[PDB]
Design a protein that fits this description.
homodimer, Jelly Rolls, 5-stranded antiparallel β-sheet, 4% helix, globular, binds sodium ion
Chain lengths: 105, 105
């Protein structure tokens, strides 16, 4: 079986938000998003995929549709297919998210 | 948007493993599994769904195919469609897992 210690996979990118693939199949993307202060995933729309952001470390501002939320460790936000969504690190510390997208875009 | 504090949703069941739905759509099941010592998710096979177990608290023994692993906090294991899989709490403390299944069985 495929098994990973997500703590070990964590890494950052000074140029832009790091997208770290953990597992992948046509059925889903299981990734880690590592955001340094000021970094973000630009707002976008997935025609037929749902996405869920879960905060592992730090805090980020998640945008889904016409609403925004402060996602702190232990919190998860759902972005249904068709809804514009994104995430921004507006804090002064790094943030790490477990992000699942299904099916694979 | 749907947003939840998973820490608040956590709960246990003395009769059997608790399955706590967080978010759900035809595209995926996003659940929390709460296992008291001795509890487990019986081994089974999903014809067309992949599943990923992520340990939030405690440790569990995950079985996928002909292999078993000790999943400690921060570790994730992938169970591809068609593979017999299950999870058992063989420790002396409770365990909490974030479990994603896609698509919804
Ligand atoms: Na991988
Ligand atoms: Na819910």
């Amino acid at each position: 079986m495929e098994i990973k210690d997500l703590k070990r996979l964590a890494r950052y990118n000074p140029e832009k938000m790091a997208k770290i693939p953990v597992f992948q199949s046509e059925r889903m993307l299981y990734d880690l998003y590592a955001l340094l202060p000021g970094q973000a995933q630009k707002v976008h729309v997935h025609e037929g995929s749902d996405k869920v952001y879960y905060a592992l470390e730090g805090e980020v501002v998640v945008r889904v549709g016409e609403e925004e939320a402060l996602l702190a460790p232990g919190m998860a936000a759902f972005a249904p297919a068709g809804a514009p969504h994104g995430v921004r690190n507006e804090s002064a510390s790094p943030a790490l998210l477990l992000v699942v997208t299904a099916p694979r875009p």
